[PDB]
């Protein structure tokens, strides 16, 4: 949730796990100001709903 504290102005975020599944996507929905998103090796296996 710390990223939600910076989501008011952050426009680029690039999180690249080494295989860990990004199981939850609740905080990512708070990224209104985001214009660039990179989900690298997040093991989602499906199109994320937060995007």
């Amino acid at each position: 949730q710390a990223v939600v504290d910076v989501s008011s102005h952050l426009q680029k975020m690039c999180i690249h796990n080494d295989g860990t599944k990004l199981v939850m996507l609740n905080n990512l929905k708070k990224m209104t100001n985001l214009t660039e998103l990179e989900l690298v090796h997040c093991d989602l296996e499906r199109i994320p709903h937060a995007v």
């Binding site: 102005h9 426009q11 214009t35």
Partner: protein, 44 residues
């Protein structure tokens, strides 16, 4: 820091305004035409 989506080519009409004086988002600047941004950065 604003909610701009596409920057119109009219930004290239400002002779005194250049890229250094242009404070825009990278995506905002990329919405400018290639000729406009090339004039913005250099003499093309």
């Amino acid at each position: 820091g604003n909610h701009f989506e596409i920057l119109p080519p009219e930004l290239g009409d400002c002779r005194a305004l250049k890229r250094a004086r242009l404070v825009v988002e990278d995506a905002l600047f990329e919405t400018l035409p290639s000729d406009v941004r090339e004039q913005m950065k250099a003499d093309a």
